[PDB]
Write a protein that binds this DNA or RNA. Sequence first.
DNA 1: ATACTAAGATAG
DNA 2: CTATCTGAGTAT
Lengths: 351, 351
Amino acid sequence: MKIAIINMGNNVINFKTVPSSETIYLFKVISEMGLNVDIISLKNGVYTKSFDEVDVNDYDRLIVVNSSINFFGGKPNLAILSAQKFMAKYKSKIYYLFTDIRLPFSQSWPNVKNRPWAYLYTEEELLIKSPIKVISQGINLDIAKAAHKKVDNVIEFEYFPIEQYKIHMNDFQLSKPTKKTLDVIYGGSFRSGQRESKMVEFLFDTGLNIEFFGNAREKQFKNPKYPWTKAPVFTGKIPMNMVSEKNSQAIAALIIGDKNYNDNFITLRVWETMASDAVMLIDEEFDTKHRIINDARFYVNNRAELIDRVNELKHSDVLRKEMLSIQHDILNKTRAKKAEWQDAFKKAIDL
Amino acid sequence: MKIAIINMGNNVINFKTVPSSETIYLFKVISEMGLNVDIISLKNGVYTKSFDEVDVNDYDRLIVVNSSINFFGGKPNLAILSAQKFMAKYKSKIYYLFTDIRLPFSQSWPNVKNRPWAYLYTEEELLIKSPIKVISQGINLDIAKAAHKKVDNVIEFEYFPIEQYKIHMNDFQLSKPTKKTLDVIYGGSFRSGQRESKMVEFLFDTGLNIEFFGNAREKQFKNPKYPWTKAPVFTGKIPMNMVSEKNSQAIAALIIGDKNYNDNFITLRVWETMASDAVMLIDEEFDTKHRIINDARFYVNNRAELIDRVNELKHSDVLRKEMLSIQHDILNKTRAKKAEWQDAFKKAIDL
DNA sequence: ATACTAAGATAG
DNA sequence: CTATCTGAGTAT
């Protein structure tokens, strides 16, 4: 039972990029399940074998982490092409991990055949004919089907909480009480549209000491529709395995709403936050039914509520520790189900 | 008082390179102050002592010419590493000359520890703990504090017109009346974005016989946001300390704006142009408050103001001299106050 | 060959 | 939008 996992459109080397670190963490958690698995990527590395140095048919299961197939600057992206070349040569069923609604499986050939560099590839080289099963992170399989109604070789759809790999990792550790230095903290990147509105709403002009870490830059918030005076402090990105300790430096860590996740996907951030020493405050829009934590106090709808809830927390150490113990209790109930989780995954890749 | 001066990331031997010349010229101007100074670098030379043969703690003052940490080809950069090991062993305050907004002081250790060759160094030998005093060439100390935010041991800030070392040199001599063969001249290299914009706004489609020397070619200008028909004449590189001799060839030398220096840093260029037989014209953005010269005639806004002024100088050999006589009187008044500059420097390195 | 380059591409 | 990531090309 030899399993191969690859990222469809991103180089896999270290933990310095989101797609790469996720592919490696998926490889690590699948290994810890007692499965023999390799990561194939563009070159040999600490975690990967080269596409050029293996026959895709030496594996009984091919898992493909979703990625986009857009070619930046119209130039050839070897990460995409080499991965699909590899997929096309596979004579068996392909398991596509759908963790981002914006990244449904997609053939590259069509987007390649009309390129100046088209001569480099042939349709037989890139066209994937194998049947594909989509393992959707989003519980709503209707949305998963919709996004793939463009590709006919997708024949199975199944829901599997992939993002739970962060809490099921053997070395998982709850954050320990921490000396606070921030009222509210939020990690992410800038995104125009409703995403800008949402962020200015919860992070700007709160009157609280807030830190926005990640890839966002203050000067990206210019839209006159969502004005502001006092912005939060911006910080550089942080290692995947440091997120929870980074969040723990604040009394409260926020989860903002997003049209591509709301009531459908539980995200890595939810767990990273719920695991920290920071009380997890969730944008009502993100989880209307409160599937995450069955306690209204963990939810906020606007700036007034966020400000009010955070101030109740910065004064009441007792209220803070209680909420903290409730979110840790909920996390652990989920963790207790590890074995069911692992079997569900084996079951999802027909093992 | 024994003073040691080093360049953080460049080797110092002679005047064959930009950074080396700067360090040696800084060295000479300080020696001419009657101070005891030594240049410490990689190998012993006419102007330098080797890092591996001197004990940094023998000096009462350690001056570090700003530089960047860029490990070309991912390989160890000996000037940066030797320099920072030297600085790390130092036990008193460090004086960092910030002559370029792009070169804030930076620790190299965080960079080295994650390199495959990290085992060749220890944090004890690279981590610089001594307090740092940034002596900024820019007069806006807020722009200087802003740049050194990442660092924590940078305690002081102070402005000092460092670029003036060229005029106060016991060597300095104004350029004598030169036979004109160019209407306009400008030295430098192109970068991108607005850098190219400006260079095209002031040196292209003017109808004037303009020359452009340094690291720059014609095709390097593609951006269809700033279109041009007739480009100036590119003369490539010239010696490394004959800029004044070069500029004097034209009727007027140009100083164009730059997001980094504008209303902050007076550059070596300014003084090398102000010292030439060429009338120095300045981009209004580079110095709006008109600090350089107090006379509107030397400043321009766009291609219009430019070509116009150059014409007034061509059709009035009398006007040329008058303005030329003005800039020289300014330089002369600055040079006469050499002692005020020197004493200001001493007070900068706490003497 | 020798020595210098004040760093360009990428992340989200 | 720049902090972070990657890792030899250019000038003598």
